[PDB]
Amino acid sequence: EDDLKTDFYKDLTSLGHNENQQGSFSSQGGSSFSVYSSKRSENINH
């Protein structure tokens, strides 16, 4: 007699992620008064 049995099992999984997010925000507020005289300025950035 000769018997010969053989198994080869291979399993491969690859997972990839690339994520890119940008946000840039700016707001301005201004009031001006002249002759009473006043100047008023506001600026905000995020």
What technique was this entry resolved by?
cryo-EM
Scanning the chain, the segments in alpha helix (DSSP H) are none
Residue 7 identity = D
Q: Is there a contact between 30 and 42 (Cβ–Cβ < 8 Å)?
A: yes
Residue 42 in tokens: 């506001």
Q: Which residues contact 23 (CB under 8 A, 6 or more apart)?
A: 46
Q: What is the resolution of this structure in A?
A: 3.3
Q: Is there a contact between 22 and 46 (Cβ–Cβ < 8 Å)?
A: no
Categorise residue 11: left if φ over 0, alpha if ψ from -120 to 50, beta otherwise: beta
Residue 5 CA, distance from chain mean position = 54
Q: Per DSSP, what are the bridge partners of residue 29? A: 42
Q: How many CB atoms are located within 10 Å of the residue 40 CB? A: 9
